[PDB]
Structures are given as C-alpha cells and as structure tokens.
Design a protein around this ligand. Structure first.
Ligand code: ADP
Ligand code: ADP
Ligand code: ADP
Ligand code: MG
Ligand code: MG
Ligand code: MG
Lengths: 148, 371, 709, 361, 372
C-alpha cells in the first residue's frame, strides 16, 4: 500500500536472511525475527515484534517463513525513526539541555522504564557511552555513532 | 460567674456588691457632674460628664446633679450612667451574667419600678431582677421577723411595721424629709454666722460639715440654753481652701428638723410621732412587740444621740408599762445592703426573681405582680 | 510534595500548606519556594546538602528551574549582581532558632567558595562571622521565647567589583531595641554583655569598675528578675566574647574603654534622685558618680548638673532649668539608652571599617556592587505584649506591606507585559494597619507622642482612653470598652488589640509612656561630647548640638529609622528566605504542627501564596514549554517548523486542555489550575516509556551489528 | 517642612520660631525706628538708635500701629526666620481681655497680607501652663505691656476669675526714667529709654521687706551698684534698684489705684470655687520678662502667704526660662496631635470673614 | 420735723432716707465713702480726710471710692458710721436722738449685721427706738397687697420673698448674691471688647451711668444678638466726662442678661425667672395661683426697659398654661422699699413693734432677734 520493496532490495534481504535460514528450509525462529531484522540494521521494538508474531504464530512449529518475514519487513519500512528523533529523545532525558547525560541516569531510563535493556546490553553500552571517562555521555555524538 | 448582684440605689449614695458579701464593694455618691466652664488645655482627655467619686473629686469645675430625688428617679439618662458606672467601673462585672436585686422606698410612683425593670432587661440585659423595699431589707440585716423600721436616707424617711414576716401596708408611713433636706437647712442656718454656701459643690462641703459636727439634742430647749450661755458646744471645721468655720447651736438645730419638720416649713409630724402613729395604726396585739423592736437604718439615723432622743420621745408617747427599745447598730448605714445580701442568698427566694422569660411574656408591668 | 507552593491545588488552605511542609520535611526536603521566595525548615542536623558538590550543582541555574535550595536563591541573587548590576539584598526572616544564623553562614560560605577571589572572599566571611560573639553580646538578650534572641536588624554586605570578586564587606545595624537597656519585662534579661562581664570578668577588671559580681546589685539588670538561668553559661560566653574583641582588632585599651561604657551603664541605673523643697531632682549617691567620672571620663560637677538640669539656649543666653524626679529618671535612662546604643553603633562602625576595600575603589575605578544579607527580628507574640513587641510587630507590618506591594506589583507588571487581563485578587491590605500605627495626627505613634508631650498627669491608661476616643470606629483596632460582650471576655482593661497580617495581638499599655520617653536633652549630649573616654568622644559630636528640636520619642525615632530601612529596601533588589523552627525542643525529625502554624502565620506565607497565585498557577515562555512537552504531539515532534507559540497552541489541543484552563500571552503560556500541569507531566511520564523504547530499539539495531556479523 | 510657626507677639520683644523647637530662633525688640532705609526693625533699630526715633507698634498688648506691625511680621518671616509664611500654619498670642478688633485684624493680616494657610490666636498665660507641665495652676504672666492672671483647674479656665493689669515692664522702665532724675541723670529720648531698660534689666531687684531695704539703703552704700553708659559715663544707683520693681507690689508709685501683683493673684484665687483654691496656691506659675527680677518669687511667696489661710501651702513656680514659657507653651500646643483640628484655615476665613476668631479661639 | 419716725433704707448702692408719712425719701445718695489718692500741694485749703455720697461723687477724680456695704452686709463699720452721721447731720439735718429709726435688711443676712446696726444706733446715735425690717416685705406695703411674691434687686442682693395673706413663708425665701454692682463689673469686662478700658473706682461709676442709661433687657436674647450682628439699629452712644464718645451695641443687653443667665459672670445659680418660679413652687395649696398673679418687682436693677415683659414671658414658660401670670412693676419701684418703710413706720399697730432703748438696756444687741 504505502510503499513497495524493489527486487534488488528483496534479494539483499534474502541474502541477509540466508545466514539465519542456513539449512535451506526458508524459515527463521519466532524468537529470532528480531535478530534477522536487526542484522539489516532495522529498529523494531519488542512490542512491535510481539504484535508481528501474534499474526504469524497461527499453528505453531516455532518458526516464520521468508514471505511473511518480507511482509513484516515491508510493514516496518513505512515510517522508521530518524537520527533527529533519537537525538531529541535523549534531549528530553537531558536535565539541563547542555548535551550530556550521566551513566547512572542512562542506566535508570534504560531499566526502570519499559522494554528494559539487559545487564549485558547496559554495561557494554555504558563502556563506550562513557566517551572520555567523566561518567557522562555526549548523546549527540553517541547518536552520530549509533546511526552508522 | 452567677452570684446575685445587689444595688441599694439610695437617693444620695449608691451601695453595691454581691450577695453573700458582708458589706458593699462599691459605695459612692449617686451623682453625675458636667463641666461648668470653658475647657482651655488641649489634649487633656476631658469628658462630657463624671460619675460618683470622679465628680466628688472635681467638684469646683462641675455642676453636680443627683438623678434621684426623694427616692424617685427623675433623670433616667443620668441614672443609666450611674448603673453603667456601677457595673463597668466599680464592680467590674457584666450585668448579663448576674441576677440583680434593686431597692426602693414604699409609696413610690409605679412608673419608677417599671422603668427600673425595663432598663435592667432592655439596656443591661440582666438574666433576672427583683425590686425589694428598703425598710423590709433592714429587718433581714437585724435577724428579726418582727419590728418597726425607721429607714432615713438622703431623700426619704419611711416607717414599715412588720409582724412575724407580715408587713401591714396600711400602717406604712412615708415622710419626704431626710439627709438632703437637713443639708439644705444647714446651708440656710449657716448664713446666720455669715458662711455662704450656694453652689452644688458647696452643698457637698455643707454635707461633710453635717456628717462630722452635727448631733441630736436630748432636750432641744436645754441645749439651746447651753449654747446661749457658753462656748462649750462650739466646734471648728477647716474648709477645702483652709478657711476655718466655727459652729455652735447649728450642730443640733440641723438634726432637730427630723423631730420638728416645721423648721423646713413642713406640716408633717416628726420621726418620733411618725413611728408612734405607725405603731398605733397597727393591731393592738402586735404593738407590745413593735415598741421593743424599733430598728433604725440609713445614714440620716447616724447622728450621735438620735437613738437616745428617739427612745425618750417614744417613751413619752407610748404607755408607761411598755418596754420601748431602739435598735441602732454601728453598721445601720448598711442594713439595706446587708439585708439585700441575705435576701439574695436565701434558697427559698431563688423562685422570686423576675426572669427575662417572664418580662418578655408580660412586659414591664410584671414587677407589680412579682414584687 | 510540590516544590513551589503556587502549585498547591487548594492554595487558600493553611492546613494544605502545613501538610505539604510536613510531607516534604518527613522526606528530608527542608526547602520549598513560593514563587521567588524560599521557605526553609530547620533540620537540627549537619545534612550534607551544603557540600561542594551542591554549590557546583546550583551555580548557574535560577529559582525558576532547579529544585528548592538556599543555593538556588544564592545563585539567583549573585547572577543578578553580575547581570543587572543593581545592588541586592537577601532577607532572612522567621523565629530565633529557625536557622537564620545557619542560613547566614551558608550564604557567606557560598559567596566565599564560588567567587573568583576566594582568599579575599574567605577573609570577608571570617571578619563577618568572627564578629558574631561581640554583636550577640551587645545586641542579643534572653526573652520569654528564647535565651539568645536578636534585638536588632543586622545587615551584612559582601562588596564586589566589576570582575565579580569580593573587594570588601559592610555591617550595618538597624532598629536596636534600646528600651531594653533600662527596663525588662518579667523573665527577660538585659543584653548579654552585662551578666557576662559580672560572672566572667577578672578581679582587676571588676575592681577598676563597679566590682560586685552579684547582678541584683544593679537596677538595670534585675527589672526582669531573670539574671541566673541554667541554659546560659555567662562565664564561658565572656571568655569567647573577650577573644572575639581581640581577634576583631580591638586593642586592649579600646576594650578597657568599652568595658568602662558597659560598667558606666550599670552605674547610671543605680543613681537615685531625691527632691529639693522645690520638687527639683538632686543626686543622693556619690558612690556611682565616683566611678562614672572615671568610666565615662566626664567631670562629676558637670554630670551631676546634666542628670538634673535641662538646658535651653535663646538669644544667646543659656538657661539651666531643673528636672523633677520623673524627668531626672527619664534623663538618666535616656543617657543610658543613648550611651549604650551609641557604643553599639561604634562597635559596628569599628567592625565595618575592618571590612572596607583595601584597593582605592574610586574613579577612574570601573564599578562596585554590593550583595547584602538582612536579618531583622520576626513577628513577636508573647503571654504579655508591650511597647517593644508593638515596635517589632509594626516593623514587620511595614515590611509585609513592602513585600506584598512588591509581590503584587511584580505579578501585575508581568500580566501587563505579557498582555493578560489582570484577574482581581482580594488580599489583606497592610496599608490600613500601618496607617493606624503611623498616620501623622491620628495614628497610635502620634497619639503616644502627644501623651508623652502634653501637660498634666498623663498615664498609660489615659493614653488608652485617648486611643479609644480618637481611633474609635476603626476596623483593625479594639479594646475592652469598644468590644462586644462576647469578645470583652478575652480582652482585659488596660489593653488594646491590633489585627495584624499575622492575626490579632493584644498590647498591655503599662509602661508605654515610660518606654517611649527618650529625654536626651542637649545638656547630656554637650556633657558627653566633652568626655575624656576615647569611645564616647567619637559617639557624641559637637555638630549634633546645632539641632534646635525637642528630643524625639522612641516610637518617633523608630518610625523614622524604619521608614529609612524601608526606603533602603525599595532601592535594592530583595530576595527572601523564610525560616521555620519545627519544634521548641531543638529536636531533629519532629514536626510540631501547632508551633509551625504560628510561624507560617507570623511569616505571612498564606497572603504571599494568594497574591503570587492571583489568576494562574504556572507560566513559561513557549520556547521552553514546547521543548519539554512536544513529544506528546507528533505534529510538533521532533521539531516544529512554525513559531513556538503556534506549536504550543496545537499541543494544548492534542493534550485536550479546556478553553478556561489556559491562556496565551506575548511570549508566555499561562496555566490556571495545577491539575493541568500535573496531568501534562504525568502524560510526559507515560510518554518517557516510548522515548526509552525508541532508544532501546535504536541501541539493539546497532549493538546487534557490533556483537555479530 | 511645613511645620507650624509660633510667634509671641509680645509688647516689647517678638519671640518667633517653629513648633518643633526647644526655644525661639528669633528674639528681637518689637520696635520700628525711623531717621532724624526709611525704617529699621528689631536689632538693626537698636544698633542704629542714636540717629532714630524708636516706636513700639504694641502698647499694653494692643496693636496701635498696623503698618509698623506688618513691618515687624515681615521682618520676622523674611529676615529673621527666613520662611515663606504661605507654607506654614502660624500660632499667634494675645492677652486675655483685649479688644476684639485686635484679633480680627491679626487674622485678616495673616490671611490677606501673609496668605498664611491656617492660624490660631492663643491666650499667653494659657500657653505658659503647657511649658510648666501643668493642667492646674494660676499663671501670673507679666511682659513689657501687660500683667495678667489666669486661673486654670483640671484644664478648665475660670474666665470670670481672669484679672488684667495695664502695668508691666515699660511702666517700670518709665518709672525708672523718672526716679533716676533724683540723682541727676536725665533720660528723655526713645534711645535713652532703651539704655534705662538695660539698667533695669541688670541692676533692679525686688526687696523682701521694702521698709527694711529702704532703711538699709539710707544707712550704707552696701546696696549701691554702678553702670557704664554707652559714652563711658558712670551711673551710681542705690535706693532706686528696689524702688522700681516695688511698683508691681505698690502700683500707687505710677499714680495707679490698682492692687499689687500679690493681691491681684490672691483676688483671682478667691474668685474661684472653694475646692479649687488649695491646688491654685500650690501652683502659682510666673512667666514673662517682668517676673525675672531677683527676689520676686520670694516676695510673691511672702505676700501670698500673708493673704492666704495659715494651713495652705503656697508654692511659686518661677522657672529659670520664665521669659520664654509663653513661646515654649506655644511650641508644645502647636505640636499636639489633638490641636491640629483646632486651626482656623483659609477655607473657613473665606466663608466667615475675620469674625471666625471668636468661634475658633 | 419734730416727733416723726426716720426711715433709712441703707442699701448696698444708695442711702435712701426720710421721715415716715412722706411720699418719698428726702435724701437719696451713693452709699460711698471716698478718700484722697494724692498728696495736697497747695497748703492753703480745708481738705477733708474723707468725703461721703454726693460730696465724694463730685470729687471722685482725686478720690478712691469704697462702699461699706457689699452684698447687703456692712463690711466696714467705720465707713458705715461716717455714712449714718452724714445721713443724719448733713442730709436729713436731724438729731437721731429725737427720732425712732426704721432700718432695712436683706433676708438670710449674718445675725451680727443686725446686732451691730442695733448697737451703733443705740450706743453711737442714741436713737430712742429702732427696728430692722426685711426689704422685700416693705415693697408689699408700697403695693397695697397682703399677697404676692416680691423680687427685690439692689446694688448687691437679689431676693425673692413669697407672702400670702400677710404671712411670709421663710423656707421659700430665695437669695441670690447677684445684682447691680455685679452687672456693673460685668459691663466693665464687656466694655474691654471695644477697647474701652475702665479700671479705677471712679471709672466704675462712669460705667454705672452707662448701664443706667443705655442698657435694656432682650425679649428674645438670641434674636437681639442676631439683630445686633446684622445691623447698627441697636447701637447707642455715650459722651464720657472728658468729651470722648463711646459707642455700644449688644453690650447693652448682654449686661442685663446676666440676671437671666448668671453663668455670664461665672455663677452656677438659676436666673431671676427660675428663682422666682422655684420660690413659688416651695409654697402651699391655694397660694401658688395668687403668687403668679401678684409677682411684684422692686429695687433699682429691676428698672431696665423690657424686664417685666421678659419676666412675664419666662415665668409663663415655666408655670402652667391656665395660670394668670401677672407682673407688678410700677414706675416708682426704684424706691418701693423706702415707700413701704414709710407706711410700716406710720401704722398705729406698728408702734408697739419698735425696740425701745429700755429693751436694749435689759438685753443687749441680741434683742433684734426677738423683735424683728
Ligand atoms: N455620720 C453621719 N452623721 C449624720 N448623717 C450622716 C452621716 N453619715 C452619712 N450621713 C448622711 O446620710 C445620708 C446618706 O444615707 P444613705 O442611707 O446612704 O442615703 P441613701 O440610701 O438615700 O443614699 C446623707 O445625707 C449623708 O450626709
Ligand atoms: N533680667 C531682667 N530683669 C528685669 N526685667 C527684665 C529682665 N529681662 C527682661 N526684663 C524685662 O522684661 C520685659 C519684656 O518681657 P517679655 O516677656 O519679653 O515681654 P513681652 O512678651 O511683652 O514682649 C521688658 O520690659 C524687659 O526690660
Ligand atoms: N434705670 C436703671 N437702669 C438700670 N440700673 C439701674 C437703674 N437705676 C438704678 N440702677 C442700678 O440699681 C442699683 C440701685 O438700686 P437700689 O435699690 O437703689 O440699690 P440699693 O438698694 O443697693 O441701695 C445700682 O446698681 C444702680 O446702678
Ligand atoms: Mg437609703
Ligand atoms: Mg510675651
Ligand atoms: Mg435697693
């Protein structure tokens, strides 16, 4: 409806999907749809992935096929979040508006709010969000890094 | 705090306090004083009027007035100042808390009780009040159920015979001669030595001379002959400016007016005859006991020798077998007070007070049914 | 609980104000605002809130952004002194023991540690604070309410240059309660120095002065019958006080001159007058004059004469006219009040000249600006109130008048500047009760000034009778005469009631004439400016004898000096700190609501809240409001392409505000009910879930490509 | 500013100042002098008096030359006090039993010549009680032109008991000019009258017993004193020192029929009510410059002790500042908060004309 | 005249003296002794120590004038003997040793005043018989009435004596020490308001003549004040002895108003209208009506024009509306005491009332209190 995938883009998505398909059955695990999408650098939420899986886990077998993966890819590609939007989302958590947030307050907003980061995801984030060792993140440079 | 107030609204002295006291807490002249002269010092705190001891202290700049004359209240706007001063300045009470016992003479105008009653309930908001008769209260102070009371105030002399707690209201006698008439006559007779007293302030100086120097002669014509023939009866008095008065027969001429009212030009019989005529107007079976119980009260009975002359004169009027006694207690100036503190403490008399409920039901005519 | 009281939903409720104080204080949040004003409740604890990490947190951000702290007011007033370059005051107010001296020390610690010349700033702090035992000894006293209440308004500048570096300071003292020198109420002492000298003094020190250590030996120490009390250690306090004079550069001979003034004041109160056969006063006792001629350094024949004669000068002839016993007692007491308040003015000058700039501070020098702290006595209600409470409570009335005027003016001029129609607030008009005290020929002070002046036997009860006659129909005045029978139970004869902003206060008139007389005749001043004592020769000056007026009464001098403190405070930019003592036991954690209700009322915090709230709870420039709340309205997110005003105008439709809940000014949005603001910050709290969700999804879409492939 | 002005328009000296003050700023003789400028006023008239005729526009407390009195009020305001009177309410003074036209013409000149905003005229002896601190007492005021007695009790004047005597300091100066001719000294001109006033002010006193001082002066030179005249000639004076002030106690020396100041005081006390007199005897207040003689309070006490009853205490309040109690009392009165409702304002003068002084004062 | 009685009304202001049975007094003169102030300088004249009555008024510029009677009391007895000697030797030209002498007095006088009149008549003047009549009782003999209330006012006393059917009611006798000399002293005080200063005892006699000529009683005092404030129609003028013209206005009814308003001269007393009404209200049953209809006025301070119309108005205002208030104020009322004393001393039934010198030898000066 709103946008349509090109045959070359479908082939690039099939090439990336092939690493998770591996044996050639043409299908990925229901816990693994987010992994194959994030391998292409997409930003799906866990609530979006639950709303996706609810329409394709219709008869079990723990898995989803390439046609329904490509359909759910074409659903997410309509209105993806921007560099300016993720930079402004940190700017709303910034208490002073000066461009810096503390590692302790980042750990708070990543784990007291919904869709929580795991301790693996937080400590490896903080390890490079602490850019020059003062315990604060320059979130504008961190978004210029994270959007690569 | 709900103790009964008692006011003896005498003609010349307010005497006021609480029931169950032995003596009045407030005793002050029943006068209002208004400035006679031009107020010249600015910021002085001068007043439209002064009351009681304030007026008696400032006399030389004031016209003094008594709102009561002959035991009748003649100036209600000033009598309200005296009652307001009694409660608010002298006793330091709210009258709205205390049932108030008032006094008056017998044979008074009915409008005097009604207007006392109205002022107490509509101006002073008392919870209850009563109007007792002065000479009846004077038997309570004596501890007697029987006797004839001579009460002599500043305005009125009255005789009330009582037998076993029953007054004989037809035998009550009233004589509108008392201590103010004796003061106005002492002002007349003092001009014979050339001492002129004429202002309402000088009337208080002549009152103080009358109180300190006068006495009642046991035989007036013998004391007149004693004064005509010696200086032995003469006494000096020093006036407020240090001038020294001396008086002689004027010391017993003034009090003798009670025994001879013709010195004022009055036709009436003297206080001895008025007592005997009041006894003789009673029933024969009660007279023996009345003669043995002549109770004298009020400040005009305070003269030296008056209980001796009054006994002598009644003994000559009454039968030679009768046992005439005169009760002249040292406190007799306060027997109407002491009687009012007794007849306000009594438990059997707490039903007698006119309540504001009964005054609201009946209007001011309630005193004629209750008192 | 709510940080700024203008966000309180039922802002008209004293119980909802005191409940939010209790809720914050239970939570250890000892500070709150009321617009620009700060409320502080004493923690009775060394809370770590004053440490360096909080100074660097609060330096650079205003009262309208960072959460309540003393250092939010401190920053706000300092950056005004850098930005507007108008001079500043902070007023510290509330009860003795409410933390006013701790607030004063921590404001001077912030202005030492956070400013660009910390060695000179720390020196001016130490010279301001090491002067405290001396000022407290000469200027605090025990009252019925506290063992160490300040009885003067104490002003303390730190003086800054064009660079924002402290070059110096100042001390100024206002409105010292000098009626205390010669008279005290029951349960109150004189100023602390006398009892400290008698109990703490050395043998030669006492022996050279009047030497009897028992304080009941002196009439001016014992009128309040309170000399010994177990809470005060006068011996120990004098050993700290005497060292403060040494540390504040009083040379030993200046301290001996100064002790000689303190002992002269003790001896003056022991002078007894007998009458001549003409009712003129004569000094009976040579034994006080034997010392006063040494300790004041004046000739005894001259002092005998000055204590007992008034001098007129007319056509160049000078005429000694004798005093009656009442005038000679008032002349002895006027000299003691004058000699004591002048040696205190001299102490403050001698301290203040040690704070002055060492560099020339004079043209072509660039600029200089002062930041002040004013600490003046709070409102005062006791078991019995009298002439000094009347003066203190008039002072506080006149400061509440200034404060509510400036608060109301500040809200009106904002609504006019932003183009909002001023929704009318009706508030207790302090003007009416100041006019009752001070109006030139009909106020209480003028009626009292007449009663001390007018001829005849004037008395305290005659002064009350004249108030009853001349104030008569006024709505904020009452007496037992003017009272109805119901209120006449509560209010005695010989008392008047004023309705103040802090409620009704009842003053007993006894001693109003004795305390208001200040008969310092030119003969006493001429005697004292001839003194051999180096202090007294600086305190009384030959130019003061050129004044031909009669002696002004204490209430007149107090009115004039208070009007001068008010015109000083209108000239400066004022900030305000208002201090609450949370119980009378000096106890941590305990919130004594009955005592806090009195303080919240005495401080006038409900009238402040009312006048500050006015039409709308909250307002903010659209530039700041839109950046906070645009995330709720996708058409404005992450950036709005139009004007901020139009971005807010679509956002308040998206949030669903009703047309009566908000208004739009020239640059500020106004929000009427704090219901709307809280429902918006709560909508933002549930929207932070989406903002974190977006960051977590963006992180997982990057982090997966870091740990794999 | 705009504080009240206070002038004691005395017969002999103007005392002028402001209601706030201890004492008058301007004190100068109530004189205009003209040659023999077209005229000189006050201290300039005394300074030049050898070439002038000196006239007093007040005689016996009545203003007799209104064009010269305007010169004195103009000199008071614009030369001596340095004020515009249009800015200041003005308190003036008068003796009790003066002509009514004297007040009305004072009043008209204040509102129409000086444009004064408000004014009041107060009785001099009434003002003298305020300076004395008293609301009860009898005041003997005595100046250059008038001696008057006003009894006051509890702040009420007794206006029937007010006594006036047209004998004071100028009549004594003119009597000293007469009795000094017996030793051979002739003082005749208006300037020589001012020299004789300066002698009267320095040499005269009141004898405690006149026949015993006359016997003293006749038997020794121990009472004789000396005065240097302005050309350096020397007066000697003796008997004349107490002969002159005796005229207050024996007015018959002027040829007057009146009772002395001691009898005139007692006659006021004895016109008051009996209750008042004790407090008047304990409060005899003396004021004005002819009460300044050495020995006059002792003589007044002796003489009123002899007239009064022997149990009464007589006290005489003769303050050192006697000469200024009228002005000091005017300063107090014009300073009272209660008095500010009692001024005559130009709004009331514009309705009522000059007749307003009899309603207000 | 050989054997007639003498009638001598020794009032405070004037001696009025004559024989009984005459219509009017033969000698009327001021009750004054005058003594010189100055020293005599031509030692070539018969100059007296003192002058009496009309001698003293002719000399008064050089004299100090003193009245021996003040408020109806003889205060100086040497000066009163000089007046009685002048009255007998110079004025009547009689030996008083040959004539019984009727004297007069105010009521409520000191008793010593009658005893010293008695002692001086019998010891000094050797009078054969003597009597002291009360002054307001005499004005009824002149009126031809047994009943009336009499207001008598002289130089020193105003008194109010009610008499019914020949009986005096002595409790109802009112006395007011306010009359002609008090009104003169108040006119001297009032005259100061126009700058006319009168202070000597001779100037008191100049002001006494102004009062006698120019003063009148206002019928409504506030309407006369309003008439004098708004016009000169009430102003009159007076040439003084040295040719200076006084002009006078409301002063000429403010002086007499002190009779109706004693508070003008500082007294607390009720006015003469209230004092008259109060003296009637002290009286008996049928007699109040007959006192109102016989309200007699006597003595010189009742001579102001309009004082009977003012008195009739003020007493009509106090009394009931059915009473016939009627004021008897004859033209001869200035001499009514002397005229009535002439009748008393002539009556056949009075000739036993005299105190004879035999009765004064049996009992001393106190005999007057039995006889009078
Ligand atoms: N010691 C006394 N001797 C004679 N009369 C006295 C004496 N003390 C008081 N009085 C007179 O008694 C009168 C007051 O008596 P009181 O009974 O109190 O009168 P009232 O009840 O009418 O007020 C006054 O006339 C007073 O002068
Ligand atoms: N020390 C003195 N001794 C005697 N007379 C004095 C003395 N000082 C002033 N006087 C006299 O006092 C009179 C002035 O008195 P004052 O009160 O000033 O009068 P006034 O108010 O009328 O001007 C003059 O006659 C003057 O000579
Ligand atoms: N025509 C008059 N008008 C007013 N007063 C008059 C008149 N004639 C006389 N008098 C005054 O009345 C008094 C004389 O009254 P008189 O009865 O003769 O006095 P007294 O009885 O004392 O001798 C004097 O004061 C006199 O001046
Ligand atoms: Mg009685
Ligand atoms: Mg003067
Ligand atoms: Mg006559």
């Amino acid at each position: 409806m709103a946008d349509q995938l090109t045959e070359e883009q479908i082939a690039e998505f099939k090439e990336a999907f092939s690493l998770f398909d591996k044996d050639g059955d043409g299908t990925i695990t229901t816990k693994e749809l987010g992994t194959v999408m994030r391998s292409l650098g997409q930003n799906p939420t866990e609530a979006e992935l639950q709303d996706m899986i609810n329409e394709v886990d219709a008869d079990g077998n723990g898995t989803i096929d390439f046609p329904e993966f490509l359909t759910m890819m074409a659903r997410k590609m309509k209105d993806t979040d921007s560099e300016e939007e993720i930079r402004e989302a940190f700017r709303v958590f910034d208490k002073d508006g000066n461009g810096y947030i503390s590692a302790a307050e980042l750990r708070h907003v990543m784990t007291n709010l919904g869709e929580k980061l795991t301790d693996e995801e937080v400590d490896e984030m903080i390890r490079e969000a602490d850019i020059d060792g003062d315990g604060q993140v320059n979130y504008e440079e961190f978004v210029q890094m994270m959007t690569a | 705090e709900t103790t009964a107030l008692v006011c003896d609204n005498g003609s010349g002295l307010v005497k006021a306090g609480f029931a169950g006291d032995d003596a009045p807490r407030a005793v002050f002249p029943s006068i209002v004083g208004r400035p006679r002269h031009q107020g010249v010092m600015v910021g002085m705190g001068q007043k439209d009027s002064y009351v009681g001891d304030e007026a008696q202290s400032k006399r030389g700049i004031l016209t003094l007035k008594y709102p009561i004359e002959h035991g009748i209240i003649t100036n209600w706007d000033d009598m309200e100042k005296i009652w307001h001063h009694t409660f608010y300045n002298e006793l330091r009470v709210a009258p709205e808390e205390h049932p108030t016992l008032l006094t008056e003479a017998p044979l008074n105008p009915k409008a005097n009780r009604e207007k006392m009653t109205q002022i107490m309930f509509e101006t002073f908001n008392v919870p209850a009040m009563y109007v007792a008769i002065q000479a009846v209260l004077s038997l309570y102070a004596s501890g007697r159920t029987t006797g004839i009371v001579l009460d002599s105030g500043d305005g009125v002399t009255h005789n009330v015979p009582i037998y076993e707690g029953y007054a004989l209201p037809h035998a009550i006698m009233r004589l509108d001669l008392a201590g103010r008439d004796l003061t106005d006559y002492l002002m007349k007779i003092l001009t014979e030595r050339g001492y002129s007293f004429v202002t309402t302030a000088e009337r208080e100086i002549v009152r103080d001379i009358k109180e300190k120097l006068c006495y009642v002669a046991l035989d007036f014509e013998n004391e007149m002959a004693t004064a005509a023939s010696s200086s032995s009866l003469e006494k000096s008095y020093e006036l407020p400016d240090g001038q020294v008065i001396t008086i002689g027969n004027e010391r017993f001429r003034c009090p003798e007016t009670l025994f001879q009212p013709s010195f004022i030009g009055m036709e009436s019989a003297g206080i001895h005859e008025t007592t005997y005529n009041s006894i003789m107007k009673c029933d024969i079976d009660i007279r023996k006991d009345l003669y043995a119980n002549n109770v004298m009260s009020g400040g005009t009975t305070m003269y030296p020798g008056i209980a001796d002359r009054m006994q002598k004169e009644i003994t000559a009027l009454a039968p030679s077998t009768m046992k005439i006694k005169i009760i002249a207690p040292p406190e007799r100036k306060y027997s109407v007070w002491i009687g009012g503190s007794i007849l306000a403490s009594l438990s059997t008399f707490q039903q007698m007070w006119i309540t504001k409920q009964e005054y609201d039901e009946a209007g001011p005519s309630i005193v004629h049914r209750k008192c | 609980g709510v940080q700024d009281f203008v966000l309180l939903e039922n802002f008209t409720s004293e119980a909802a104000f005191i409940e939010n104080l209790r809720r914050r204080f239970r939570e250890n949040l000892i500070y709150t605002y009321i617009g620009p004003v700060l409320v502080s409740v004493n923690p009775y604890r060394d809370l770590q809130i004053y440490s360096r990490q909080h100074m660097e947190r609060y330096r650079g951000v205003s009262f309208y952004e960072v959460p309540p702290h003393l250092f939010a007011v401190a920053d706000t007033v300092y950056r005004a002194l850098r930005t507007e370059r108008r001079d500043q005051a902070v007023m510290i107010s509330g009860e003795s023991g409410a933390g006013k001296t701790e607030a004063t020390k921590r404001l001077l610690q912030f202005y030492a540690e956070t400013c660009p010349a910390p060695e000179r700033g720390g020196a001016v702090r130490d010279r301001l604070l090491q002067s405290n035992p001396v000022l407290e000894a000469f200027g605090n006293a025990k009252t019925l309410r506290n063992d160490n209440s300040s009885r003067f308004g104490k002003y303390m500048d730190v003086q800054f240059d064009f660079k924002g570096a402290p070059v110096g300071g100042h001390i100024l003292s206002y409105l010292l309660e000098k009626s205390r020198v010669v008279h005290q109420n029951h349960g109150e002492r004189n100023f602390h120095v006398f009892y400290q000298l008698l109990e703490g003094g050395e043998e030669e020190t006492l022996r050279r002065l009047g030497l009897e250590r028992n304080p009941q030996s002196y009439l001016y120490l014992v009128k309040g019958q309170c000399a010994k009390v177990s809470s005060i250690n006068d011996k120990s306090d004098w050993k700290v006080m005497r060292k403060a004079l040494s540390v504040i550069d009083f040379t030993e001979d200046e301290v001996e001159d100064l002790l000689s003034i303190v002992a002269s004041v003790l001896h003056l109160g022991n002078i007894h007058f007998a009458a001549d056969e003409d009712s003129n006063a004569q000094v009976t006792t040579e034994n006080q004059l034997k010392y006063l001629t040494r300790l004041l350094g004046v000739e005894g024949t001259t002092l005998r004469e000055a204590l007992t004669h008034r001098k007129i000068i007319a056509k160049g002839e000078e005429l000694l006219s004798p005093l009656n016993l009442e005038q000679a007692a008032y002349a002895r007491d006027a000299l003691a009040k004058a000699v004591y308040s002048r040696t205190f003015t001299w102490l403050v000058r001698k301290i203040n000249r040690s704070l002055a700039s060492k560099d020339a501070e004079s043209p072509s020098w660039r600029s200089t600006t002062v930041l002040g702290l004013l600490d003046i006595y709070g409102f005062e209600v006791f078991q019995h109130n009298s002439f000094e409470q009347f003066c203190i409570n008039y002072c506080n009335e006149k400061l509440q008048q200034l404060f509510i005027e400036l608060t109301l003016k500040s809200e009106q001029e904002e609504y006019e500047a932003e183009g909002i129609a001023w929704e009318p607030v009706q508030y207790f008009n302090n003007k009416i009760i100041c006019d009752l005290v001070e109006e030139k020929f009909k106020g209480i002070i003028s009626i009292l000034d007449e009663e001390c002046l007018r001829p005849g036997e004037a008395t305290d009860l005659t002064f009350l009778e004249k108030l009853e006659d001349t104030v008569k129909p006024h709505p904020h005045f009452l007496t037992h005469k003017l009272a109805d029978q119901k209120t006449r139970k509560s209010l005695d004869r010989g008392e008047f009631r004023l309705l103040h902003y802090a409620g009704e206060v009842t003053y007993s008139v006894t001693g109003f004439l004795d305390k208001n007389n200040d008969l310092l005749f030119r003969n006493l001043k001429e005697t004292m400016c001839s003194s051999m004592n180096p202090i007294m020769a600086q305190c009384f000056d030959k130019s003061e004898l050129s004044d031909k007026k009669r002696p002004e009464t204490v209430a007149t001098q107090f009115k004039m000096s208070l009007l001068q403190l008010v015109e000083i405070l209108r000239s400066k930019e004022p900030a305000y700190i208002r201090c609450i003592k949370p119980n009378d036991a000096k106890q941590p954690g305990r919130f004594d609501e009955v005592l806090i209700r009195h303080q919240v009322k005495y401080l006038g915090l409900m009238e402040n809240l009312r006048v500050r709230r006015a039409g709308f709870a909250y307002r903010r420039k659209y530039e700041a409001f839109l950046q906070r709340y645009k995330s709720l309205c996708p058409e404005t997110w992450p950036m709005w392409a139009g004007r901020p005003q139009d971005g807010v105008a679509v956002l308040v439709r998206h949030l669903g505000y009703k047309p009566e809940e908000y208004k739009m000014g020239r640059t500020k949005i106004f929000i009427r009910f704090p219901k709307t603001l809280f429902a918006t910050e709560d909508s933002l709290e549930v929207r932070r879930q989406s903002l974190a969700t977006k960051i977590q999804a963006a992180w997982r879409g990057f982090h997966w490509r870091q740990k794999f492939l």
